[PDB]
Amino acid sequence: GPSFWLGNETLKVPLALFALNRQRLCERLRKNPAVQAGSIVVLQGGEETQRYCTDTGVLFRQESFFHWAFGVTEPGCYGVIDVDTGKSTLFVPRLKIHSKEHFKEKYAVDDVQYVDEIASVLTSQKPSVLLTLRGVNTDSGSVCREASFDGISKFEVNNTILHPEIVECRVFKTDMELEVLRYTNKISSEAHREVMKAVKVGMKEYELESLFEHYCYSRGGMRHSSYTCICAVLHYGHAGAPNDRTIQNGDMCLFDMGGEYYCFASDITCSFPANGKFTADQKAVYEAVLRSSRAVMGAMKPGVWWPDMHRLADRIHLEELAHMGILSGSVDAMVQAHLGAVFMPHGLGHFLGIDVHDVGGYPEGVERIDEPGLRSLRTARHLQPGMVLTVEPGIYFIDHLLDEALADPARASFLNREVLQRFRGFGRVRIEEDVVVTDSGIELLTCVPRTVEEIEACMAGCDKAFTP
């Protein structure tokens, strides 16, 4: 059948991918006892937006649930799925201008109609109930926009059934979806290598962000970054602003960037010395995060409770920080005092898919854990095959977190100021891989240099094939 493709070396994505998602959603809804016969799923695609009151266009990016179901890149559409038969209808704006037939062929749907006819067409199809999308995103706190059209009031509308079901479908990636996520990770990994090869003392961080974006777009067809790429919030107020810090000798760099292809995300972080040679201290902190990274990846398999992996990373960080002489005392005591969250205040990792922070981390019955570090986890679910997660432990030296710990009698004793003082302004190490949960373990999607020797080799311009 047809496939989405941007030519050259970019990935051909069969539109069958979305047909399989529609099939899976219908199969789930058919097994749902509360779904009436003759129900129709109604999704509304995104519309083009402009900057405020101007006619300056904002680059259009399809709404994620609508993309997941249909793969449609055009703004202003609606999409309908008959639950009982699986029949799909795309509604496109009545505006070279393409025919309805052109869109039917392009997207391999069963029917195409114009948007202004949606009320007439649905009336004629006599559905029992329209199933629309409404629910809460547990990362943004926002409520998903329910589809609406002139005349929808004449129909029976249920806005509670669909959201948890289509979320759960998105949580489990198909083999076709994995092929795209492998590709996004391949291009983003190559871009990360290019950045490590290009970085020079004296460069502005945004020069590297630009290079990353150029690699992803020109060689990967990735028009969008998946998320705001982190290399300043400080100097200009938003993560999106150019990071205009000058890279200095002795710096540890952290680049957190990932491109998006056809609305499938990647999210990768590399940490490395600006000048291409790890100091003893840098090697020590870095290899601590490498150790937790690898321990978690080695422990992940179906049935594993994700918060247990976060705690495992914490324990390893604390062990290694103690082996460095930054911390002293009982590691068990440190864990009881939640000392790990001083060095890693964020969650270990999160679902990834069409969204960087993908849906379904906190379905009904799954509770957020009200402890330092863990409260920042974007899911507290148990791992199952088909999930895609980031694994992103880090160690940070953040003054106000350290000072707070030093002011806390329950924590302050564990800290050796004489050694710690040398790590003030050390910076940050984070190692972020993307992985798939398999039937028995994981598959690593990311492919960047990770050991000290591999990183130093990459920055010295060694061919990627070279291995130390």
Q: How far is the CB of 447 from ligand [O-] (least distance, A)?
A: 17
Q: Does 350 bind ligand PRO (CB under 6 A)?
A: yes
* Using rule CB under 6 A, residue 256 touches ligand [O-]: yes
Phi and psi at residue 354, in whole multiples of 5°?
A: -65, -30
Residue list 422-451, contact with ligand [O-] (CB under 6 A): 432
Query: 346 among the known binding-site residues?
Result: no
Judged by beta carbon, residue 63 or residue 267, the one nearer ligand [O-] is 267
Phi then psi dihedrals of residue 94, to 5 deg? -85, 110
Q: In the chain, which residues are last before a break of more than 2.5 Å from C to the next N?
A: 95, 231
* Residue 251 interacts with Mn ion (CB under 5 A): yes or no: no
- For Mn ion, the closer CB: 105 or 139: 139
Task: Fill in the per-residue mask, 369 to 388: x = in contact with ligand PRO (CB under 6 A), - = not in contact.
Answer: ---------x----------
Write each residue from 253 to 272 as x if it is in contact with Mn ion (CB under 5 A), else as -, in one continuous string: ---x----------x-x---
Number of residues that bind Mn ion (CB under 5 A): 4
Nearest CB to ligand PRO, comparing residues 58 and 410: 58
Q: From CA 133, how far away is CA 138, in angstroms rounded?
A: 15
Three-state SS for the chain is CCEECCCCCCCCEECHHHHHHHHHHHHHHHHCCCCCCCCEEEEECCCCCECCCCCCECCCCCCHHHHHHHCCCCCCCEEEEECCCCCEEEEECCCCCCCHHHHHHHHCCCEEEEHHHHHHHHHHHCCCCEECCCCECCCCCCECCCCCCCCHHHCCEECCCHHHHHHHHHHCCCHHHHHHHHHHHHHHHHHHHHHHHHCCCCCEHHHHHHHHHHHHHHHHCCCEECCCCECCHHHHCCCCCCCCCECCCCCEEEEEECEEECCECCCEEEEEECCCCCCHHHHHHHHHHHHHHHHHHHHCCCCCEHHHHHHHHHHHHHHHHHHCCCECCCHHHHHHCCCHHHHCCCCCCCECCCCCCCCCCCCCCCCCCCCCCHHHCCCCCECCCCCEEEECCEEECCHHHHHHHHHCCCCHHHECHHHHHHHCCCCEEECEEEEEECCCCEEECCCCCCCHHHHHHHHCCCCCCCCC
Q: Which of ligand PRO, Mn ion, its own copies, none does 53 bind, CB closer than 5 to 8 A by kind?
A: its own copies
Of 82-111, binders to ligand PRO (CB under 6 A) are: none
- Residue 256 marked in a binding site: yes
- Chosen from its own copies, ligand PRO, ligand [O-], none, partner binding at 168 (C-beta under 5 to 8 Å by type): none
By beta-carbon proximity to ligand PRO, the closer residue of 179 and 371 is: 371
* Residue with Cβ nearer its own copies (36 or 73): 73
Residues 258-287 close enough to bind ligand [O-] by CB under 6 A: 267, 269
Q: Tell me the number of residues near ligand [O-] by CB under 6 A.
A: 6
User: Binding site annotation covers 434?
Assistant: no
> Any binding-site annotation on 319?
no
Residue 350 assigned ligand-binding role = yes
Nearer to Mn ion, 21 or 226 (CB): 226
Closest CB to its own copies among 7 and 303? Answer: 7
The distance of closest approach from Cβ of residue 354 to ligand [O-] in the complex, given in angstroms and rounded to an integer, is 16
Using CA atoms, how far residue 140 sits from 91, 229, 359, in Å, is 29, 18, 10
Q: Counting contacts by CB under 6 A, is residue 292 touching ligand [O-]?
A: no
Can residue 390 be called a binding residue for Mn ion (CB under 5 A)? yes
Residue 109, token pair as written in the block: 């749907």
The annotation status of 98 as a binding-site residue, yes or no, is no
Question: Half-sphere exposure of 67 toward its Cβ, with a 13 Å CA cutoff?
Answer: 20
Size of the site for ligand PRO (CB under 6 A): 5
Segment 370 to 429, residues that bind ligand [O-], using CB under 6 A: 390, 392
56 binds, among ligand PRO, ligand [O-], its own copies, none (CB under 5 to 8 A by kind): its own copies
192 is in an annotated binding site: no
Interacting stretch for ligand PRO, rule CB under 6 A, among 59-67, 161-169, 202-210, 342-350? 342-350
| Selected binder of ligand PRO within 258, 276, 340, 347 (CB under 6 A) | 347
Q: Choose the one of Mn ion, ligand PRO, its own copies, none that binds residue 240, judging by a C-beta under 5 to 8 angstroms depending on kind.
A: its own copies
Q: Is 82 annotated as a binding residue?
A: no
88 binds ligand [O-] (CB under 6 A): no
Binding residues: 235, 256, 267, 350, 357, 378, 392, 432
Q: Given the rule CB under 5 A, which residues bind Mn ion?
A: 256, 267, 269, 390
